[PDB]
Design a protein around this ligand. Structure first.
Ligand SMILES: CC(C)Oc1cccc(NC(=O)c2cc(Cl)c(OCCN)c(Cl)c2)c1
Length: 247
């Protein structure tokens, strides 16, 4: 996250921190995710597509720091890693950038809700906030494009939804951004998602409910003029989510 503020998990309790273990035993951060029910975290396919082996992954809930422990945090492995069969990546745009991780503790349990671990509601079909709506994003992504390391402390920021019409302007993304995606940015281009924020939530308050409106997906640079953050439009994937969150 460029700009914005440091935060802590109690303020973003649906946020899931996703890591990958390497031969040699070192663990690196991969992407954010969001707890949509106790057994299920939702994230972005591009985070996993090159290493689609569920055993490699570690998910933390209730965690506020990258490389140290948080009181009340809970560790999970991935019981099922589900990637969207139609995922693809063009030069800029990622399509069907959505994934599901079925989580389970070493004892075989799903998440236990607490003060720092809570589900976020899914949106309903084709009911997204209007353009100009302010929403929040959270993540451990870069604070500056020139950084090579991630911040140690979770960040959040607030961005405004951009219309599909504006996002498709020539100096924005033209036809590369589709109706299955949402653009959001800061009107002064001072705050944005960035590398490492992928998979994390874009949360909008809709009819008095915190809703998972988007998932961090792609963009051109970070907080660049006329280049919004692009988000998977979760409301368009309700059938896919519903079908994969079963048996
Ligand atoms: C996730 C990792 C294992 O591999 C990746 C594979 C393909 C694409 C990505 N994406 C990014 O690194 C990424 C970078 C930036 Cl700067 C970014 O911010 C754009 C919005 N300002 C985003 Cl959203 C993703 C990673």
């Amino acid at each position: 996250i460029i700009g914005g503020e440091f935060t802590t998990i109690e303020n973003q309790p649906w946020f899931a921190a996703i890591y990958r273990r390497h031969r040699g035993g070192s663990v690196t951060y991969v992407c954010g995710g969001s707890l949509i029910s106790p057994c299920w975290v939702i994230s972005a396919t591009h985070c996993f597509i090159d290493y689609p082996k569920k055993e490699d992954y570690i998910v933390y809930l209730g965690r506020s720091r990258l490389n140290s422990n948080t009181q009340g945090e809970m560790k999970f492995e991935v019981e099922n890693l589900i990637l969207h069969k139609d995922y693809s990546a063009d030069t800029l745009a990622h399509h069907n950038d959505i994934a599901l991780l079925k989580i389970r503790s070493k004892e075989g349990r799903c998440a236990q809700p607490s003060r720092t671990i809570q589900t976020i509601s899914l949106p309903s079909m084709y009911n997204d906030p209007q353009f100009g709506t302010s929403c929040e994003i959270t993540g451990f992504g870069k604070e500056n494009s020139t950084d090579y390391l991630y911040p140690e402390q979770l960040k959040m920021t607030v961005v405004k939804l951009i219309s599909h019409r504006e996002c498709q302007q020539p100096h924005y993304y033209g036809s590369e951004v589709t109706t299955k995606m949402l653009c959001a940015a800061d009107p002064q281009w001072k705050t944005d998602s960035c590398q490492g924020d992928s998979g994390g939530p874009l949360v909008c308050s809709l009819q008095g409910r915190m809703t998972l409106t988007g998932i961090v997906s792609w963009g051109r640079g970070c907080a660049l003029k006329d280049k919004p953050g692009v988000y998977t439009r979760v409301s368009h994937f309700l059938p896919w989510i519903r079908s994969h969150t079963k048996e």
